[PDB]
Amino acid sequence: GSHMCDAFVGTWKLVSSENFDDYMKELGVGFATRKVAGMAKPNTIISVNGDVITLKTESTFKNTEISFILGQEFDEVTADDRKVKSTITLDGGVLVHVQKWDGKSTTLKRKREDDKLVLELVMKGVTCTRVYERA
């Protein structure tokens, strides 16, 4: 059967970025790591096996990999080495990824728009948009 996650499965590559440095400053990321991470052009591979979704990111900055079930909280080590409690849910056809640590929170939304996968990262008043195309 078909699922709302179907539209996300596959391999994706970063094509544009807006406000990422501001977002990283909200996370408390330092000057040198902002420079290095901001240069990266990540590729992401999204796949599904039964109820388990896997989101694997490979880049010249860091490589990350999470596997999860919608709605079930998990431990995640972010690219910038935060140790966070994460939950990913569907809100309609949008994957909503909330990361919580030290009393703080950031939300990452992934949506399909035209032939793109658009990742929005929000921390306090800062919104970053990261557009990916199929690789």
Would you tell me which residues interact with ligand O9U (CB under 6 A)? 14, 24, 27, 29, 33, 37, 40, 42, 57, 59, 61-62, 78-80, 119, 130
Q: How far is CA 122 from the centre of its chain?
A: 11
In the complex with ligand O9U, the residue whose CB is nearer, 1 or 75, is: 75
23 among annotated binding-site residues = no
CA dihedral defined by 92, 115, 124, 28, rounded to 10 degrees?
Answer: 130
| Structural element, H or E, at residue 39 | helix 31-39
Q: Closer CB to ligand O9U, residue 50 or residue 113?
A: 113
Q: State which residue, 27 or 88, has the beta carbon closest to ligand O9U.
A: 27
Whole-angstrom distance, CA of residue 79 vs CA of residue 4: 27
130 annotated ligand binder: yes
